[PDB]
Amino acid sequence: TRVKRGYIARRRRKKIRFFASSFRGAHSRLTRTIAQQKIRALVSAHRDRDRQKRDFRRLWITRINAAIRERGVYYNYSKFIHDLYKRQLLLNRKILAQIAILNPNCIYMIYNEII
Amino acid sequence: KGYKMKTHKASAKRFRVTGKGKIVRRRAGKQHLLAKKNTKRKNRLSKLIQVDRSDYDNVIGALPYLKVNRKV
Amino acid sequence: TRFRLDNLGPQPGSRKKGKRKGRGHAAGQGGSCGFGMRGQKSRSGPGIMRGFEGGQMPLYRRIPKLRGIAGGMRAGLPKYVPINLRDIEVAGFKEGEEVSLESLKAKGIINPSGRERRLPLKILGEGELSTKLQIKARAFSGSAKEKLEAAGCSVTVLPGRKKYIKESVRKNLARADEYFAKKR
Amino acid sequence: ELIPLPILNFSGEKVGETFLNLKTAPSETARAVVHRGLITHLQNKRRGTASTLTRAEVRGGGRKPYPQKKTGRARRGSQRSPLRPGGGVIFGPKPRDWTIKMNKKERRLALSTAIASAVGNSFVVEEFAENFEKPKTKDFIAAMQRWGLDPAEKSLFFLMDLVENVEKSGRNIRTLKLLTPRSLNLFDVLNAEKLVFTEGTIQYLNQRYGVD
RNA sequence: AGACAACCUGGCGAACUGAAACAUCUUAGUAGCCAGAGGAAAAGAAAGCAAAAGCGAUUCCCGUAGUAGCGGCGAGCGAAAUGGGAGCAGCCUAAACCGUGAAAACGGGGUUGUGGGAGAGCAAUACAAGCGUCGUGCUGCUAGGCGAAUCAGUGGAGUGCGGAACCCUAGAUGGUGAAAGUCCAGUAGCCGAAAGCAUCACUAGCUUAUGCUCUGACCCGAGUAGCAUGGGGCACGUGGAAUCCCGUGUGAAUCAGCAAGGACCACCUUGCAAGGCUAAAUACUCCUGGGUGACCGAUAGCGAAGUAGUACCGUGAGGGAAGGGUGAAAAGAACCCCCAUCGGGGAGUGAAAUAGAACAUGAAACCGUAAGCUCUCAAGCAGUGGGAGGGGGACCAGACCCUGACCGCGUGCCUGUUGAAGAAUGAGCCGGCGACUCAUAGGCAGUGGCUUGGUUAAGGGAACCCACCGGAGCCGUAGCGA
RNA sequence: CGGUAGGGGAGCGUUCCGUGUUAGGGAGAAACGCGUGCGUGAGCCGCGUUGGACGAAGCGGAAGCGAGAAUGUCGGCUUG
Ligand SMILES: [Mg+2]
Ligand SMILES: [Mg+2]
Ligand SMILES: [Mg+2]
Ligand SMILES: [Mg+2]
Ligand SMILES: [Mg+2]
Ligand SMILES: [Mg+2]
Ligand SMILES: [Mg+2]
Ligand SMILES: [Mg+2]
Ligand SMILES: [Mg+2]
Ligand SMILES: [Mg+2]
Ligand SMILES: [Mg+2]
Ligand SMILES: [Mg+2]
Ligand SMILES: [Mg+2]
Ligand SMILES: [Mg+2]
Ligand SMILES: [Mg+2]
Ligand SMILES: [Mg+2]
Ligand SMILES: [Mg+2]
Ligand SMILES: [Mg+2]
Ligand SMILES: [Mg+2]
Ligand SMILES: [Mg+2]
Ligand SMILES: [Mg+2]
Ligand SMILES: [Mg+2]
Ligand SMILES: [Mg+2]
Ligand SMILES: [Mg+2]
Ligand SMILES: [Mg+2]
Ligand SMILES: [Mg+2]
Ligand SMILES: [Mg+2]
Ligand SMILES: [Mg+2]
Ligand SMILES: [Mg+2]
Ligand SMILES: [Mg+2]
Ligand SMILES: [Mg+2]
Ligand SMILES: [Mg+2]
Ligand SMILES: [Mg+2]
Ligand SMILES: [Mg+2]
Ligand SMILES: [Mg+2]
Ligand SMILES: [Mg+2]
Ligand SMILES: [Mg+2]
Ligand SMILES: [Mg+2]
Ligand SMILES: [Mg+2]
Ligand SMILES: [Mg+2]
Ligand SMILES: [Mg+2]
Ligand SMILES: [Mg+2]
Ligand SMILES: [Mg+2]
Ligand SMILES: [Mg+2]
Ligand SMILES: [Mg+2]
Ligand SMILES: [Mg+2]
Ligand SMILES: [Mg+2]
Ligand SMILES: [Mg+2]
Ligand SMILES: [Mg+2]
Ligand SMILES: [Mg+2]
Ligand SMILES: [Mg+2]
Ligand SMILES: [Mg+2]
Ligand SMILES: [Mg+2]
Ligand SMILES: [Mg+2]
Ligand SMILES: [Mg+2]
Ligand SMILES: [Mg+2]
Ligand SMILES: [Mg+2]
Ligand SMILES: [Mg+2]
Question: What family does this chain come from, according to its entry (chain C)?
Answer without folding.
Answer: Belongs to the universal ribosomal protein uL15 family.
